[PDB]
Amino acid sequence: NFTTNLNQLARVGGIDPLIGREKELERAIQVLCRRRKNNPLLVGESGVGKTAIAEGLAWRIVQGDVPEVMADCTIYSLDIGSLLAGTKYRGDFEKRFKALLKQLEQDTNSILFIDEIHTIIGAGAASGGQVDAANLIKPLLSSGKIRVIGSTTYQEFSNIFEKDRALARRFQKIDITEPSIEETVQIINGLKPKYEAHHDVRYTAKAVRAAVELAVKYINDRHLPDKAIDVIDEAGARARLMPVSKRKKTVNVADIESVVARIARIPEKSVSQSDRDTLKNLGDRLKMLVFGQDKAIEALTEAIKMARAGLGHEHKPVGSFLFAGPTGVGKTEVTVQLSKALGIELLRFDMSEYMERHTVSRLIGAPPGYVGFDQGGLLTDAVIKHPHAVLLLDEIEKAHPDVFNILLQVMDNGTLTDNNGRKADFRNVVLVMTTNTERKSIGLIHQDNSTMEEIKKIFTPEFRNRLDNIIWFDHLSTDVIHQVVDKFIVELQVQLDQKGVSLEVSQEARNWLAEKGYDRAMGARPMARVIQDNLKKPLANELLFGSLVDGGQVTVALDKEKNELTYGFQS
Amino acid sequence: REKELERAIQVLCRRRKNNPLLVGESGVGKTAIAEGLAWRIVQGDVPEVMADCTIYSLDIGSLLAGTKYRGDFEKRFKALLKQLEQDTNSILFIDEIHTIIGAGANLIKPLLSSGKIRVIGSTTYQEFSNIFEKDRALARRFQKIDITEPSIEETVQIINGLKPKYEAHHDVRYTAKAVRAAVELAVKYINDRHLPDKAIDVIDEAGARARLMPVSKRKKTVNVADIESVVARIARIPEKSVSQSDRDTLKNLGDRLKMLVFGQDKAIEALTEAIKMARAGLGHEHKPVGSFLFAGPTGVGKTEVTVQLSKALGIELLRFDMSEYMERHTVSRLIGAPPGYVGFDQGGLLTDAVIKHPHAVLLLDEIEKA
């Protein structure tokens, strides 16, 4: 059972020098210089440089910048796959594990570095609940002169470690602090010449800072030390492959945007100088998909640009808004189009189902020891999955008062805590609250049910005061309604163009559809259903029976007396 | 099997993946498909492209008899493959191919990749899913064929072909009506088994039953009564022509149950009528004899009638106290423990009890508490 050597590798190559870990290195050295219980335990997280500390110690000894008492030591990295190989044998693990220790006794100054200690030290050969998993090393660690550098995550530390008190006392925890962007900027600088020599490229200072800053802003799943190098590594490969006779050896910020976007699974949102083009004409391109409530577009687009300019607050979301207008105006349409414009996902929730007292926990999750804990909360889960999406909450006024408190904490601090101990980042989510009857007037003679002080009455000042700006939506004007129905006719036209037909429909047909489709209270919600049956169903049957399969010509005819939409078919 | 055999020949002629895999359920005549292929070669009905092609049936047991000190396994396979390959027309046939693939390694993977030699493999749907899907390399070369069951009329011909062997061994004669009855009766009642296997089991059993009754040679001719007896015995459907000895129990089931339990005559009538209905045959063939929910005041004979019913009918009472199974996890006891868990050795209490006593009354006391 051979074990990889970390000093032989560093003397030939393949071991990258560790930078900026003076404090952690000194602690590991100090721990390894102890007489008893000299077994460091590099407790960290995923993506942080845990193995780097261990491999850094190897290049330090080779170079010689180590205390003479701690010199001449050879760090050995055992192959877990080798020891764990072989099964259904009474002594395979014992022979392999005790062979490594025996071959290590010959070198009384050698150090052992076991990566992923929890895998082999949690259950080595725990067949049928055997208790031999970690009992072999325990006497060796406390008494034996053999040292065992362990590296595990913080979560695994709690799940397995600290429960076996005997094993925990024989290990010295070494806490990692997840270095900040500034610390990571110096780390990538030292590694810049190494990557530049392999890819024969050059990285600009702007690109280095942009890559680390963009990864933390968008790549939340991975940690900063490893993910940042991933972007730099990928940009070098892409900077070399994409050029065709251009010979663009330099690596500008542009290449960084491409790789981060692709690895983040987003539609080009994480790009520099590209958003400014859309921000310049965000309202213009939005006005082509929405008709009316133009004043609302100005309030929404300015706040978005205000937040994107980097002048907002760090402990608050990009912007909290309370869209207020009668039902059907199109606040949801503005949001469903804003997300596609800004290249962000869309989160849609309805507070109608969260009006009970026990249903509020469905957003943040049930407390531990109660029903609903395992899956968690849909709100915090969706936010963690898409921290850049747009949050839409329909009919917020119906929500229970406890739910308002949850939103208050979000708008005040910009973060929520999941029932599993996670932290839902809200600093990059556009919070959108929509606020607004079907039953006829209860009177002898029916009457109109159409409906600044209204919001103050239905919303406490503490909630209103936390909003960035309350955008108002104007009632759909009669002239505007003619524009809205045109979008459905042209939408069907492009859909029908794929089949090969052209609808002759003119404003005469839209006249009846307008009043029938649009309602003052329901708004334009029945409008979609109108085309679904009146315009789509009749053409569908004839189009498929064979008359218009190989190219078709259709038309519309509305008779005053019939008060219905007739159709004409040709081919 | 003219349509099933056609599938094998066309894939064999294919340039790639020329390895017909006759995947079928147990007792579906999978070996017959490949055994029948050899017959057509001599007759010459097979297409000329594949005409004059030898078929070799590999014996796993013969090759497994390794005499050399661990060198027989590889030497036997290596020399055998070359003999089949040099001819270039032979199409090897391996029944129960799953055994060869399993360690006992095979060393036939290079041969399959090249495709110079065609090998036919038979395997059950179970084993095919467990191992062949995992190894894409092995299953890619083999084209899974589907064999579900033969036609009803065709089965009677297969029985006639095999009838002389059974008649000579049992010294009995099977009437044409009996064979048609067995095929029709067996498929209708024994749903779990397949038409080819069960059809020959009842025929074999029917002959043994007739010969065994008389000490001397007698009862040569076999009547449909025996076929009904053996098919009913395996299917467990209540046999017709009920004996007068058993026509008293059902006739006096209510009176006996009324003496032990007084009052609540409606409960006794429902139970006795359902039991009598099942024996008549006018009962569901995919549902229990009777599902009855007994509710009422305390001490009204809800449990007593069930217990006495078992005693009167002489069948075991599988009494289960549902109060124990308050939690969802307790369901494992009834349905069964998982295959790999610590309790896998213990079987399902409900499943094992029902298997041990198929006709036993099942009493689920306090079902609501479950």
């Binding site: 259904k88 044998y89 009474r90 050969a125 725990a126 067949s127 049928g128 609940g129 026990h358 049930a366 020891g369 109660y370 029903v371 609903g372 804990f373 395992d374 | 000190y69 661990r70 939690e327 996890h329 998982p338 790999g340 868990y341 610590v342 896998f344």
Partner: peptide, 25 residues
Amino acid sequence: GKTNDWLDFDQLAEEKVRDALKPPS
């Protein structure tokens, strides 16, 4: 109010094996 759920914990059976060898000659 609320219902306090209970999480059952499963146990898995893993057993070691020993090999009785046969001398070749």
